[PDB]
Amino acid sequence: ASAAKAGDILLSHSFEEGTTQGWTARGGVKVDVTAEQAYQGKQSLQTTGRTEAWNGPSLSLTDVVHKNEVVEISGYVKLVAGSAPADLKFTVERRDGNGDTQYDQVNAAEQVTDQKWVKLQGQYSYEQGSSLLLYLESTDAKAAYLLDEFQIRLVKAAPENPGEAGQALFKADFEDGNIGNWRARGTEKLEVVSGIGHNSNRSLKTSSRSETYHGPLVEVLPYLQKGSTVHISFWAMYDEGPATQVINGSLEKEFNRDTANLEYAMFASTTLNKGQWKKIEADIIVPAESTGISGLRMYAETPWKQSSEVTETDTIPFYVDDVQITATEA
Ligand SMILES: [Ca+2]
Ligand SMILES: [Ca+2]
Question: FRET label pair with 255: which of 17, 32, 161, 211, CA 20 to 30 Å apart?
Answer without folding.
Answer: 211
